[PDB]
Design a protein around this ligand. Structure first.
Ligand code: 0L1
Ligand code: MG
Ligand code: MG
Length: 263
C-alpha cells in the first residue's frame, strides 16, 4: 500500500518541513506524486517527526483532524486524520503569537485530554478510553497548512502533519468526571465580539470517541497512545483567520477561558 521509495520519503519530509520552518507555502505534493497513498503520507509525517526528535524537540502530544461529518465528506475520506505536536508549538494562556512565523493561520477551539494509562487499538471503544483520561484542557489550535491558498487534498495534508503549527492551552484543567465533554459549550470571541461557537459533540459525537479513533488509527502502524499523552481531540468551532493585532478569548462552559494576542 506504498508507492514512494525510501529516498522520496526522506526528501519529501525535508521539503515539507522546510516550508513550516522557513515560513513559505508549497504546491500540494500529490501534484508531483499523484499515486501517493495514505501510508506514504503517514510515512512522510512520521519522518518529519523523526527529524524534529533528532534535533532535540520533544513530541508533547497528538492531534486529530477532520473530526466532523462535514469535514470528512469534503475531503472524500471516511475517517479522521492525526498529526503530532512538537514542544515549540505550545503557547501559554494569554500569550503572544508571532504571525511572521506563520503563513496563513486560522484558529479552532478544541478540548484536549491528557491520558494516565496506555491505549491500544485495534478495536478501541469509548468504554476503553474513559478510565485512561487524567484530565481535560481547554485548547485553541492555530492551524496553518503549508499548501498555498489551502489548495490541497487529505493525503497531502497528512504529509504536512495535518497543518499543525501552534496550540494555546488555558482555562481550568479538570478531571474528566467533572466535565461533560459531549455537552461542553465553547464560545470564541475575536476582537471583542462573538464569532463562532459549538459543543463538544461536534467532535465525532463525543470528544472521547476521537481518542478511541486515534488509538485505532495508530494501531495500523503498530503504534499506540502511551500514558501521559496530550491529545487535541478536534475542532469544536469553525476555523477563523487571525492576523497581527488580533485578540482572541475563547470561553469554555464551566472551565474559564483561553486567550491569546497576535502580532
Ligand atoms: O482539523 C485539523 O486540525 C486539521 C485540518 C487540516 C486541514 C486544514 O488546514 O484546514
Ligand atoms: Mg527557520
Ligand atoms: Mg484542529
Amino acid at each position: 500500500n506504498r508507492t514512494l521509495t525510501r529516498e522520496q520519503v526522506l526528501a519529501l519530509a525535508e521539503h515539507i518541513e522546510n516550508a513550516e520552518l522557513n515560513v513559505h507555502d508549497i504546491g500540494k505534493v500529490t501534484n508531483d506524486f499523484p499515486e501517493m497513498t495514505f501510508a506514504d503520507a503517514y510515512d512522510v509525517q512520521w519522518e518529519i517527526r523523526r527529524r524534529k526528535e533528532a534535533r532535540g524537540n520533544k513530541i508533547v502530544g497528538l492531534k486529530m483532524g477532520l473530526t466532523s461529518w462535514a469535514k470528512m465528506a469534503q475531503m472524500g475520506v471516511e475517517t479522521p486524520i492525526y498529526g503530532f505536536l512538537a514542544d515549540y508549538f505550545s503557547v501559554p494562556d494569554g500569550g503572544v503569537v508571532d504571525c511572521s512565523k506563520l503563513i496563513h493561520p486560522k484558529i479552532e477551539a478544541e478540548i484536549s485530554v491528557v491520558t494516565k494509562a496506555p491505549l491500544h487499538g485495534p478495536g478501541c471503544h469509548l468504554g476503553d478510553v474513559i478510565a485512561a483520561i487524567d484530565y481535560v484542557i481547554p485548547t485553541v489550535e492555530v492551524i496553518d497548512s503549508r499548501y498555498e491558498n489551502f489548495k490541497f487534498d487529505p493525503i497531502s495534508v497528512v504529509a504536512d502533519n495535518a497543518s499543525s503549527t501552534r496550540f494555546i492551552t488555558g482555562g481550568r484543567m479538570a478531571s474528566l468526571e467533572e466535565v461533560d465533554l459531549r455537552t461542553l459549550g465553547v464560545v470564541m470571541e475575536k476582537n471583542g465580539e462573538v464569532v463562532e461557537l459549538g459543543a463538544g459533540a461536534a467532535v465525532l459525537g463525543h470528544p472521547l470517541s476521537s481518542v478511541a479513533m486515534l488509538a485505532n488509527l495508530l494501531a495500523e502502524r503498530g503504534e499506540h497512545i502511551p500514558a501521559g499523552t496530550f491529545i487535541m481531540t478536534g475542532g469544536i468551532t469553525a476555523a477563523v483567520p487571525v492576523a497581527p493585532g488580533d485578540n482572541i478569548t475563547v470561553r469554555y462552559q464551566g472551565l474559564g477561558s483561553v486567550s491569546a494576542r497576535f502580532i
